[model samples]
Target: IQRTPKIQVYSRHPAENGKSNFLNCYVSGFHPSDIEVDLLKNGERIEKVEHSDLSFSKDWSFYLLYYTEFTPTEKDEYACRVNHVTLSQPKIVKWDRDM
Candidate 1:
């Protein structure tokens, strides 16, 4: 099963003086579609919000914050995917980051 190594919080702290704001996520498997996040922010799961409803024109297998934005002030640790569901057997990623 393939798995995403691990991601850290790259929150824009300057706005909150490096606060604990964060955004977490976990998706099923890989999809035959391309996932593109136009915005990504770290904040409360209820505060930060962004999406066009018609912006993402693809079937994303992951819960992309579409536009990561939030509040509350806390750290976020999210996980998502484009194809595989269970980590027991994740699809292999032929390439690494940087497309």
Candidate 2:
């Protein structure tokens, strides 16, 4: 079965401009265990990201987590881009600064 991934982009701590924090991209509920998760800063991919080992659920759907350390700024945009066979186009989820 093919399942579209559910993606969430958030910060480990409450987002605050100029403060160092962890930005995360969590992708889950997908199948076939192959996917790409990229952390984006201003629409471009960020470097030196860290990832959790890919894992699957009881139903065999897969999940992966990616994160990077960053300092948030009011002028910069942050997001996560996902590429998977199940998606017709790349899925981009932006971080909610207010969260």
Off by over 4 Å in 1: 1-5, 15-66, 74-99
Q: Could you tell me every candidate's TM-score relative to the true structure?
A: 0.24, 0.93
RMSD of each: 9.6, 1.1
Deviation (Å) of 70 in candidate 2: 0.5
For model 2, what is the error of residue 72's alpha carbon versus the real structure, in angstroms, after optimal superposition? 0.5
Tens digits of per-residue lDDT, candidate 1, 6-53, equal 222233333352444433332223343233332222221233544333
After superposition, the stretches of candidate 2 with alpha carbons farther than 4 Å from their true spots are none
lDDT of 2 by residue, 1-99 (tens): 889899988889988788899998989999878898888888899989999999998888899899898998888999999999988899888888854
- The models' CA-based lDDT, in order, is 0.31, 0.89
What's the lDDT for candidate 1?
0.31
Candidate 1 lDDT trough over 10 residues, lowest sum: 90-99
Clashes of 1: 22
